[PDB]
Design a protein around this ligand. Structure first.
Ligand SMILES: *[B]([O])([O])[C]([C][C]([C])[C])[N]C(=O)[C]([C]C1=[C][C]=[C][C]=[C]1)[N]C(=O)C1=[C]N=[C][C]=N1
Length: 186
């Protein structure tokens, strides 16, 4: 019950919400070898555009430590898109999602399947709490997500849900992006 059954490299499942409830969505990225650049589409608001800029800066620094020979994030012209195209989107909570998509694309490695994540990323890779955890978790469960990555400071929201919703979910409460990296790329 979602746009991708199997995600290719550069595609990651995120989580959103409104007053009506949660939903899943996908961050898509692609690149062409020609300093690189990042072009963003998907009717993104300013806060979400800034989060893409932070994620891009941090992903470049993270990849330089983890794979110094990989120059894809420093030299390529990268495009990031969040379908559906006509739907307005905003907020900082896809920061981790965007970092992961860029690293996935640069490494040519898909992320673990049936994984979704939500979490704001700071410039140094700290993972900050987000809103809508109850709604997002319900939406993840309905979409068949079995592994969900959440900010550690949102534990209380997760445990406000009835047990039958969260039972057997592999839940990871994280404080730093490097924990997310190890989950997405085992
Ligand atoms: B996250 O909660 O910040 C998320 C980021 C990304 C996945 C879109 N954004 C949202 O959930 C927003 C609500 C919002 C949160 C925080 C600040 C401002 C706005 N939701 C949406 O953008 C949305 C929801 N459903 C469908 C389409 N778009």
């Amino acid at each position: 019950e979602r746009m991708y059954d199997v995600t290719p490299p550069g595609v990651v499942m995120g989580l959103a919400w409104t007053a009506m409830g949660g939903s899943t969505l996908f961050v898509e990225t692609s690149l062409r070898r020609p300093d690189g650049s990042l072009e963003v589409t998907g009717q993104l608001g300013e806060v979400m555009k800034e989060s893409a800029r932070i994620a891009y800066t941090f992903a470049r620094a993270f990849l330089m430590q983890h794979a110094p020979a990989n120059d894809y994030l420093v030299t390529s012209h990268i495009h990031l898109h969040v379908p559906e195209g006509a739907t307005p989107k905003d907020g900082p909570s896809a920061g981790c999602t965007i970092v992961t998509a860029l690293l996935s694309l640069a490494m040519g490695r898909p992320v673990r399947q049936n994984l979704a994540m939500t979490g704001e990323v700071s410039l140094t890779g700290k993972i900050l709490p987000v809103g809508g955890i109850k709604e997002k978790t319900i939406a993840a469960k309905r979409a068949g997500v079995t592994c969900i990555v959440l900010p550690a400071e949102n534990k209380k929201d997760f445990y406000d849900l009835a047990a039958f919703i969260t039972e057997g979910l592999e839940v990871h409460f994280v404080e730093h992006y490097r924990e997310i990296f190890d989950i997405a790329f085992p």
